[PDB]
Amino acid sequence: LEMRIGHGFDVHAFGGEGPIIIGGVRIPYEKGLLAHSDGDVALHALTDALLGAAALGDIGKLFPDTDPAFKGADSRELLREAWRRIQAKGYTLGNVDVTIIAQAPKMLPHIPQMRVFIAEDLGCHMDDVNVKATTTEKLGFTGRGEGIACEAVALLIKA
Amino acid sequence: LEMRIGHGFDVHAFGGEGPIIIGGVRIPYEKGLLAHSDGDVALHALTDALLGAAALGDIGKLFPDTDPAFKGADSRELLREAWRRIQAKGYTLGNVDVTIIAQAPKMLPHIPQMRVFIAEDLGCHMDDVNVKATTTEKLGFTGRGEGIACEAVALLIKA
Amino acid sequence: LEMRIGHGFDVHAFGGEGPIIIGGVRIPYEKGLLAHSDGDVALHALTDALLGAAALGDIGKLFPDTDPAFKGADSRELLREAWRRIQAKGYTLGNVDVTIIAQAPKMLPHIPQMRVFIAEDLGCHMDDVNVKATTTEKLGFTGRGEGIACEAVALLIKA
Numbered sequence A, B, C: 001l002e003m004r005i006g007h008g009f010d011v012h013a014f015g016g017e018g019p020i021i022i023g024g025v026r027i028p029y030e031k032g033l034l035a036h037s038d039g040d041v042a043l044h045a046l047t048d049a050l051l052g053a054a055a056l057g058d059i060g061k062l063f064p065d066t067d068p069a070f071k072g073a074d075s076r077e078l079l080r081e082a083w084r085r086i087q088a089k090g091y092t093l094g095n096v097d098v099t100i101i102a103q104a105p106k107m108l109p110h111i112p113q114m115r116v117f118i119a120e121d122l123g124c125h126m127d128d129v130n131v132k133a134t135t136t137e138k139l140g141f142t143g144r145g146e147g148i149a150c151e152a153v154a155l156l157i158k159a
C-alpha cells in the first residue's frame, strides 16, 4: 500500500453562445466555452490531477494534438482513457476533489449529476468524488465573466 | 486506515476600511474585506478543503443562505461546525496546509496565532497545521491590491 | 507510517530579457523573470509545498532576507537546503506534482530535464516527480503574457 497525490488546473474563455459542459453536465448559459474540446474545464483539471498522481503527467503529453478526431471532443472520453492507462500502471482510486471557479452560471444544482458522471467514468463510489464551486467576487478574469477556471486534487493507491 | 485529500479556494474583495480577519486573526490594514462573513478567506478555503476531503463538500452546500444569523458571521464558528460534521462521519485529522495569496498586508507576523486558532478549532496539535503567504508580484487582482485569495489542502484519516 | 500533504504557489513577473529558468532548466524566451532569485517559480512553489507538508512552512520563514548572498540566487540550492531540513525532521518523499501556468514559452520539451533536476535534488526516483504545464487561454495576467504562475502539491512520509 502506497498513496500518491496529484494536482490539476484548467481555464477556458467564454465565446459564442451556450450551453457549456462542466463535469459532463450540459448547463444553460448565455455564452459558450471556446475550445477544441468539450471545453470541460472541470474534467480537464481532474484528468490532469489523476495523470499527475500517476506521473504520466499531461493530457498534452498523452495526447499530443491528434487533432482531430477532435472538435467538440467529449472530455469524458479523455477522462476514461486517461483512467484506463492509470489503472494499467497498477493504480486504484483513493478519492478526488474538484473546485470550479466561476462567477456564473450557478454550479450547485448540477453538482450531483457531475458526481454521477465522474464516479461512473472512474468506476468508483460517489463518496470518492467531491465537487464544489466558488466565485471570485467579481475580481479577475473569472470575476469579469471572461472565463471559467477549475482546480482539482486526486489521491491514488498502488498495491 | 484510509487517507483522503481535499482542496479549497476562496477570494474576497477589499472594501471599506480595516481591519481584516485572516485565520481568525485581526490584522491592521487600510481597507477591510467585503462580505457576509468575517471575510475570512483563509478559514473559508480551509473549511472547503476539509469538507471536500470528506465529500460533503461545500460551505454553500451545508450552509445554504441561512442568512442571517449572519452579518460579520464568525468564520471560526463555520470551521468548528464543519469539523463536528466531518468527525461524525468518522474522520480524524491528518494535516492541513494553507496558502494566503495577498500583496499586502504582511501575513508572516500573524501566522503563529493563526495556527493556534486553527489547531484549537480542529482539536489537533499545531504541528498538523501549516500556514504560508505569497504575493503575486503586483500582478492580477491580488497584485493590484483589489482583493485577497487563499488556497488550502487537507488530508483526512478514517478508521 | 503516516502521510502528510503540502501545497505551494508562486508568481513572477516578466521583465528585461531572457532566458528564464524553470524547474532548473534554462529556457529561451524574449523576456526574463524579475526577481531576487533564479525567478524559478516552479521550484519556489515546490519548495513551499514540501515545507508546508512538513509544517516549516515558508521559504520566507526559513530564509528571511539573508539578502544577499542572493542576486540570481540558485533556486535549486534553496530546494536542496529546504530538503535537508525536512529530512532532519524524519520525513521521506512520497511524491510531488507541479503545474506551471504560462501562456508561453512552451514548457513540454523541457519537462523531462526539469524532472531529472528535481529528482536529483530530492534524492528520489523520477517516477516520484511529475511536472505539467497549462495556459490560461489568453486570460488574466498569465494570459496577457505579464508573468508566470505555478502550483505544486507534495506528499510526505514519516517513519
Ligand SMILES: CN(C)c1cccc2c(S(=O)(=O)NCCOP(=O)(O)OP(=O)(O)OC[C@H]3O[C@@H](n4ccc(N)nc4=O)[C@H](O)[C@@H]3O)cccc12
Pocket: A010, A011, A036, A037, A038, A044, A058, A059, A060, A061, A063, A064, A065, A066, A069, A070, A073, A074, A075, A076, A077, A078, A081, C101, C102, C103, C104, C105, C106, C107, C108, C109, C132, C133, C134, C135, C136
Ligand atoms: C480522448 N479524446 C477524444 C479527447 C477528448 C477530449 C479532449 C481531447 C483533447 S484536448 O485537446 O481537449 N486536451 C485538452 C485541451 O488542453 P488544455 O485545455 O489544457 O489547453 P492548454 O493549451 O493549456 O494545454 C495544451 C498542452 O500544452 C502544453 N503546454 C501548455 C502551456 C505551456 N506554457 N507549455 C506547454 O507545453 C501542456 O502539455 C498542455 O497539456 C485532446 C485529445 C483527445 C481528447
Ligand SMILES: CN(C)c1cccc2c(S(=O)(=O)NCCOP(=O)(O)OP(=O)(O)OC[C@H]3O[C@@H](n4ccc(N)nc4=O)[C@H](O)[C@@H]3O)cccc12
Pocket: A101, A102, A103, A104, A105, A106, A107, A108, A109, A132, A133, A134, A135, A136, B010, B011, B036, B037, B038, B044, B058, B059, B060, B061, B063, B064, B065, B066, B069, B070, B073, B074, B075, B076, B077, B078, B081
Ligand atoms: C456557521 N456560521 C455562523 C457561519 C460563519 C461564517 C460564515 C457563514 C456563512 S458564509 O456566508 O460566510 N459562507 C462563506 C461565504 O461563501 P464564499 O465566500 O465561498 O462565497 P461564494 O459566492 O464563492 O460561495 C457561495 C456558494 O455558491 C455556490 N456557487 C458558487 C459559484 C458558482 N458558480 N456556483 C455556485 O453554485 C457554492 O456552493 C458556494 O459555496 C454561511 C453560513 C454560516 C456561516
Ligand SMILES: CN(C)c1cccc2c(S(=O)(=O)NCCOP(=O)(O)OP(=O)(O)OC[C@H]3O[C@@H](n4ccc(N)nc4=O)[C@H](O)[C@@H]3O)cccc12
Pocket: B101, B102, B103, B104, B105, B106, B107, B108, B109, B132, B133, B134, B135, B136, C010, C011, C036, C037, C038, C044, C058, C059, C060, C061, C063, C064, C065, C066, C069, C070, C073, C074, C075, C076, C077, C078, C081
Ligand atoms: C538558498 N539560497 C541560496 C537561495 C536560493 C534561491 C532563493 C533564495 C531566496 S528567495 O528570496 O529567492 N526566496 C524566494 C522568493 O520569495 P517569493 O518569490 O515567494 O516572494 P514573496 O514576496 O511572495 O514571498 C516572500 C515572503 O513574504 C511573506 N509574505 C508574503 C505575502 C504576504 N502578504 N505576507 C507575507 O508575510 C512570505 O513568508 C513569503 O515567503 C532567499 C534565500 C535564499 C535563497
Ligand SMILES: CC(C)=CCC/C(C)=C/COP(=O)(O)OP(=O)(O)O
Pocket: A139, A140, A141, A142, B101, B139, B140, B141, B142, B149, C101, C136, C139, C140, C141, C142, C143, C149
Ligand atoms: C490562485 C491562482 C490559481 C492564480 C492564477 C490564476 C490567474 C491566471 C489569475 C490571473 O489574473 P487574475 O484573473 O487574478 O486578475 P486579472 O485578470 O484582473 O489581472
Ligand SMILES: [Zn+2]
Pocket: A010, A011, A012, A037, A039, A040, A041, A044
Ligand atoms: Zn481544457
Ligand SMILES: [Zn+2]
Pocket: B010, B011, B012, B037, B039, B040, B041, B044
Ligand atoms: Zn469566503
Ligand SMILES: [Zn+2]
Pocket: C010, C011, C012, C037, C039, C040, C041, C044
Ligand atoms: Zn518566487
